[PDB]
Design a protein around this nucleic acid. Structure first.
Ligand code: K
Ligand code: K
Ligand code: K
Ligand code: K
Ligand code: K
Ligand code: K
Ligand code: K
Ligand code: K
Ligand code: K
Ligand code: K
Ligand code: K
Ligand code: K
Ligand code: K
Ligand code: K
Ligand code: K
Ligand code: K
Ligand code: K
Ligand code: K
Ligand code: K
Ligand code: K
Ligand code: K
Ligand code: K
Ligand code: K
Ligand code: K
Ligand code: K
Ligand code: K
Ligand code: MG
Ligand code: MG
Ligand code: MG
Ligand code: MG
Ligand code: MG
Ligand code: MG
Ligand code: MG
Ligand code: MG
Ligand code: MG
Ligand code: MG
Ligand code: MG
Ligand code: MG
Ligand code: MG
Ligand code: MG
Ligand code: MG
Ligand code: MG
Ligand code: MG
Ligand code: MG
Ligand code: MG
Ligand code: MG
Ligand code: MG
Ligand code: MG
Ligand code: MG
Ligand code: MG
Ligand code: MG
Ligand code: MG
Ligand code: MG
Ligand code: MG
Ligand code: MG
Ligand code: MG
Ligand code: MG
Ligand code: MG
Ligand code: MG
Ligand code: MG
Ligand code: ZN
Lengths: 122, 125, 53, 206, 114
RNA sequence: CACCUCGAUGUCGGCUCGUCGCAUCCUGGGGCUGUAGUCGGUCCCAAGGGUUGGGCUGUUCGCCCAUUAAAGCGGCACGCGAGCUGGGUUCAGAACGUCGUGAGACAGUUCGGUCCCUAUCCGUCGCGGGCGUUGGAAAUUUGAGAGGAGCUGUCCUUAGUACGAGAGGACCGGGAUGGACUUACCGCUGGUGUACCAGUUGUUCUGCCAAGGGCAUUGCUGGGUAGCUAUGUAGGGAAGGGAUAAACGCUGAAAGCAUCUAAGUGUGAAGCCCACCUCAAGAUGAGAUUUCCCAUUUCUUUAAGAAAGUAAGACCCCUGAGAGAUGAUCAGGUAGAUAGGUUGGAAGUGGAAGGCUAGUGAUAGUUGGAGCGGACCAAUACUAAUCGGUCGAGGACUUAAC
RNA sequence: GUAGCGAAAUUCCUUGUCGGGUAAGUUCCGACCCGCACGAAAGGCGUAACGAUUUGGGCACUGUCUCAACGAGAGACUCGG
RNA sequence: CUCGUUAAGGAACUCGGCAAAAUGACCCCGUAACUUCGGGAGAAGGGGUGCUGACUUCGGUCAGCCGCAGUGAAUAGGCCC
RNA sequence: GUAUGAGUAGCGAAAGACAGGUGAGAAUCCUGUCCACCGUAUGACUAAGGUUUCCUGGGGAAGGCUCGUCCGCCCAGGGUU
RNA sequence: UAGUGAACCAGUACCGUGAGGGAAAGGUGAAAAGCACCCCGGAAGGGGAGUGAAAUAGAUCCUGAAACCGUGUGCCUACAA
């Protein structure tokens, strides 16, 4: 459950390290975002030499959350942290490498490139 | 569920232990409606421990029953003092060895003058 | 808030309509025949369900 | 199609393909058609149905006489079903859970659990006032309206008794039917506490 | 409750091994990326067992790529081909929630070889 | 302007709660277009629903950030302070600029500065009692009327088709999945869970060891049943009728023509009446059906008379919860599983005590998934629902028919 | 009207302009100086230490909030006084 | 009203982080700009703490043991620009 | 003087339980047992102040925010070397 | 409720540190003949029996108004603004 002002780690190498949520896209009054949702965020801490830089407004997709996802088979998955990946408008990740595991929910959301780059999918 | 009897948790536990031990000692006491309807379960569970009779049940009961003098007799020119716990496991357990629960009865009596609190008599069958 | 207007005798009596006592559960005792509350020990003879207590 | 049952409780079931779905277990001892109402005798068409056999000591001579037509024991619950084919029913006829097949879409009616006296926040999902910043307005029902009417408009929702209302859930699914046990498994949850009366009917929307 | 037990007795599985929280288990979980079906092995310590009957569930925790992950499975789900008890650990409580805060060496569990 | 209020009508903004108007912000229908298509512009009909989260500022407003289908405009004492706040206006303190010879003051700023009231009446939200509904009762019911709900995105397909030189790119139709809202419920994920389990500190008590109790926020700490719960789960605003708004007609004269209208006849909107959900015969117009009881006794007066036993039935009283402020509702009262206990389980906790074994010891292993186990489940009349009492009909008249 | 300071507890115009901070800053910080209407003992400027002083930012922290849920006690509620 | 707990988020609340939360004892390491050279300073930021043996220069050290957690409860600064 | 509000607000920080006794009458007085509270005090002395409130035996009109068989209250005796 | 504040143990009770301020409160019956005795009750208070011309003159005592409270019932009242 990611909402405005919520801070997430960046699970790629685009340059941003920690981002802050500005909006939860997809609804007028939408409050919370979970895995596979796209958010507008700000880079509150960036790698010194990265492409994306501090204070830049960017879109990202939540790739794992502390409150995770419920699968149709009755199972659940939960991660130890909230991490997102900065993406272009076409869902292609801004960075080139993904760090840490990623949830399988991104496949049906059609983040195929992110899923392929992920070192592990659960 | 259980009644709060208008007390905090610790105070309610202390009052229940007192009244349960009093009923063990006397075998007949007068209290209010709610107090009797709670003391019945507690005292019957104590008697269940007494029926079991083993050391483990004795210690469990000791956690609850107070350390009072159930009675005193004079035997062999010696004063023998029997505690509430000793009376339980020596007299009440053997007494009810046959009954399957329902060791106590509650008789409704007239309301108390000071409060009109419904009074009852609780005793062993 | 305070009573804007005093309450008249008629309205006062109307409100107290339901402010009355009741007596219920009285019936003859088996042992002595005096009136007793049902499910209670007959205070006079101290008998209940045909036995002294 | 309709039947009366008892809300046994809630559990879950694995369907084909291994999906896990929550189900409500509703038991329906075969109901008995106690009376048939027609346009001629009553002005409308419906069938009265009884359920949950009742001990004789708990019934009245009028109640026993009423069920005497159906030639069965006294019933605890009696309800009328409309929008059915009177030709297919007659006094004394039985209705069993096998009326519904798995995958049928039904409407389930019950009596919501009673919450007793409840404040506006819980009862109507209203917003609280701030809990700090000097606020002395936490769980109150808001303003009562404008000055001009010199009154409070009706439907100004306030605290009061909550629950215990007749509620219908539409378009539930009959996950399974066990005729031997007189049980219907309905996907989801339905109003009412365990052992309460439940009314299953074929979904009107369909 | 007895009626519910009878209804769900059929779907209760039987090949469930004897494991308790604190033991390392490998779960052969079935997944579908479409028509094709595949088995993914989720190996980790059992952090939690709760519920009863058909409703019983268990949670398995593993640290993958420096991020902790927990998967909760129904105990009688057919989507899990097999549960395999890799090791028996020694724990003193039913719920190992404290493991979430621990990292690496701190989170190690002593084996017992039941 | 000075008509009510100065023996007091609290004054901005915000919060809680909304309600209403349409001069309509989105969604719906349509005309015109300098409407190719996608977009639009303007106008007409339309108030059913919806119409945001932040940075700054006491702010309204406004600017900005990011979204949205849209981020409407207004009334209700610039709605709402016996509902809240008190940041500002504005008391007394103090200071700056300024004015004054001065006390002081604003043609201005800045820091700090007591928000009282137990609801009588109406009104509003819930719940009972009385009587009525024309013999007395137990159930099931129709619906006069009333309330609730009413929103909408994106994607796929039709189809890169129609249109277009290309760029670009549909109408109509058919699917999938969301946002917000909302009705329920605890099987799942979690929360809580002060008479559940365990660890542990200090001190004190049970004479001591061992084992426990008391107090320390429930001493603290880790879990957690029932119940109550959302962020959890399931469902809903689906389809379709009838009369219409603007608009478009068909036929058709007045007026040989023309003409949607005068007669006649039709299409047509998230709107109106239904449809869906809920309440509902105190609907004094008190409705309807099924079933039960039976025409008793005494005295007055022909009385729709009076009282007194009852019948069907209900209640008092008592055991209770799925109910509950109290009433009430519902489950029961030995024709008994209503509660308590007992017995057996379950959740839950996590390996009791007493032994044994190893170790110098802390402690570990074993006896043994043990012990304990509020509300959960199933049996069991062992305990208590005993014994009893109160109330409760005999059914008017007139006129059709039979 | 010198030095010094200056949109200041003083700047109405004013949210002055520029720079910093923020995704966005009428507040805040640095600078500029057309000082409406600073200025040298009704002291000017600066200043370590100090402040239940006023002001802005950051970490930590959280039911302050999204958005409320449960539990304990007292009153409320029923009965007697 | 007083009090305990709270999923995910963590000031988005609000005039204002008001209130609450958080820090808190001792021991060791370490500690900035600036400064009136005293301070700033308990800056900051870290580590240790229970129990049982062995040895000690008596403060430690080593070895082992247990728990989620050792100033295991109560009492004790939030910090920085 | 008596109403209304109204048999309503309130009954002034916290633990009591049972057995026995007394008595016309007992949750409230006495005895007993356990429990609980304070313990740099809620303990022991004292100055001021109060001025008989001290003790014994009676009483339950009024006072005691309930009750009271009881009292720092009322009645009668006595008490400060 | 007049008449001195004070017809009565009044400059008192009471209020205030003090100066000072400052009340309320008359009536049995001719005569106490002030209800022996009995009954209910622990008492209080009643019912008899007595005193008295009168006790609804019984010490809250001449008369005994109204507000206010209550009992009994001749009439009306649960579709009414
Ligand atoms: K005025
Ligand atoms: K409005
Ligand atoms: K148009
Ligand atoms: K509208
Ligand atoms: K703001
Ligand atoms: K106010
Ligand atoms: K007002
Ligand atoms: K009024
Ligand atoms: K201890
Ligand atoms: K103690
Ligand atoms: K009726
Ligand atoms: K300047
Ligand atoms: K100036
Ligand atoms: K300062
Ligand atoms: K200060
Ligand atoms: K809280
Ligand atoms: K918020
Ligand atoms: K502000
Ligand atoms: K510092
Ligand atoms: K440690
Ligand atoms: K400190
Ligand atoms: K008065
Ligand atoms: K009154
Ligand atoms: K005495
Ligand atoms: K007289
Ligand atoms: K009268
Ligand atoms: Mg305690
Ligand atoms: Mg809100
Ligand atoms: Mg009006
Ligand atoms: Mg004039
Ligand atoms: Mg006035
Ligand atoms: Mg219009
Ligand atoms: Mg900020
Ligand atoms: Mg206003
Ligand atoms: Mg007002
Ligand atoms: Mg001057
Ligand atoms: Mg201050
Ligand atoms: Mg649940
Ligand atoms: Mg459950
Ligand atoms: Mg010991
Ligand atoms: Mg103590
Ligand atoms: Mg500026
Ligand atoms: Mg000056
Ligand atoms: Mg000078
Ligand atoms: Mg100076
Ligand atoms: Mg939280
Ligand atoms: Mg803010
Ligand atoms: Mg805001
Ligand atoms: Mg604070
Ligand atoms: Mg500590
Ligand atoms: Mg009142
Ligand atoms: Mg008191
Ligand atoms: Mg102290
Ligand atoms: Mg004395
Ligand atoms: Mg005395
Ligand atoms: Mg008294
Ligand atoms: Mg007279
Ligand atoms: Mg007189
Ligand atoms: Mg009418
Ligand atoms: Mg009438
Ligand atoms: Zn008797």
């Amino acid at each position: 459950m990611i909402q405005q002002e919520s801070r997430l780690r960046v699970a790629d190498n685009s340059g941003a390290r920690e981002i802050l949520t500005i909006k939860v896209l997809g609804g007028s009054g939408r409050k919370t975002a979970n895995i596979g949702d796209v958010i507008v965020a700000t880079v509150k801490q960036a790698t010194p030499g990265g492409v994306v830089k501090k204070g830049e407004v960017v879109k990202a997709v939540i790739v794992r959350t502390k409150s995770g996802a419920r699968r149709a088979d009755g199972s659940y998955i939960k991660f130890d942290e909230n991490a997102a990946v900065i993406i272009r408008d076409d869902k292609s990740p801004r960075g080139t490498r993904i760090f840490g595991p990623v949830a399988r929910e991104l496949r049906e959301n059609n983040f195929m490139k992110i899923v392929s780059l992920a070192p592990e999918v659960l | 569920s259980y009644r709060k009897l208008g007390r905090t948790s610790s105070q309610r536990k202390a009052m229940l232990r007192d009244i349960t031990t009093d009923l063990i000692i006397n075998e007949r006491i007068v209290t209010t409606e709610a107090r009797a309807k709670e003391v019945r379960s507690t005292v019957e569970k104590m008697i269940t421990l007494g029926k079991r009779g083993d050391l483990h049940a004795r210690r469990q009961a000791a956690t609850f029953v107070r350390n009072e003098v159930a009675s005193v007799r004079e035997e062999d020119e010696s004063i023998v003092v029997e505690s509430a716990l000793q009376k339980l496991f020596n007299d009440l357990g053997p007494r009810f060895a046959e009954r399957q629960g329902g060791y106590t009865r509650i008789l409704k009596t007239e309301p108390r003058r000071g409060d009109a609190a419904p009074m009852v008599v609780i005793e062993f069958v | 808030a305070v009573p804007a207007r005093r309450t008249s005798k008629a309205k006062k009596a109307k409100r107290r309509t339901h402010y009355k006592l009741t007596i219920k559960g009285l019936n003859a005792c088996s042992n002595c025949g005096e009136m007793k509350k049902s499910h209670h020990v007959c205070p006079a003879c101290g008998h209940y369900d045909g036995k002294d207590v | 199609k309709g039947i009366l049952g008892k809300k046994v409780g809630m559990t879950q079931i694995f369907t084909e393909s291994g999906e896990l779905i929550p189900v409500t277990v509703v038991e329906a001892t075969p109901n008995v058609v106690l009376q048939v109402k027609t346009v001629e005798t009553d002005g409308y068409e419906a069938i009265q149905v009884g359920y949950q056999d009742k001990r004789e000591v708990l019934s009245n001579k009028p109640a026993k006489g009423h069920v005497a037509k159906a030639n069965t024991a006294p019933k605890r619950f009696i309800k009328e079903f409309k929008n059915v084919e009177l030709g297919e029913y007659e006094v004394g006829k039985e209705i069993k859970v096998d009326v519904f097949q798995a995958g049928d879409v039904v409407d389930v009616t019950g009596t919501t659990k009673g919450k007793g006296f409840q404040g506006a926040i819980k009862r109507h999902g209203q917003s609280r006032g701030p809990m700090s910043h000097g606020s002395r307005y936490h769980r109150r029902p808001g303003s009562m309206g404008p000055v001009a009417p010199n009154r409070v408009f009706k439907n100004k929702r306030l605290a009061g008794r909550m629950g215990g209302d007749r509620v219908t859930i539409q378009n539930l699914e009959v996950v399974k039917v066990d005729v031997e046990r007189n049980v219907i498994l309905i996907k989801g949850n339905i109003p009412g506490a365990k052992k309460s009366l439940i009314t299953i009917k074929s979904a009107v929307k369909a | 409750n007895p009626l519910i037990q009878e209804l769900t007795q059929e779907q209760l599985r039987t090949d469930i091994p004897a494991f308790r929280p604190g033991d390392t288990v490998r779960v052969h979980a079935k997944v579908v990326e479409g028509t094709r079906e595949r088995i993914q092995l989720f190996e980790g310590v059992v952090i939690k067992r709760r519920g009863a009957g058909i409703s019983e569930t268990y949670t398995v925790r593993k640290v993958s790529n420096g991020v902790g992950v927990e998967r909760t499975f129904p105990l009688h789900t057919p989507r899990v081909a097999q549960i395999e008890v890799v090791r028996y650990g020694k724990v003193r409580r039913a719920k190992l929630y404290y493991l979430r805060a621990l990292h690496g060496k701190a989170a190690r569990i002593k084996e017992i070889r039941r």
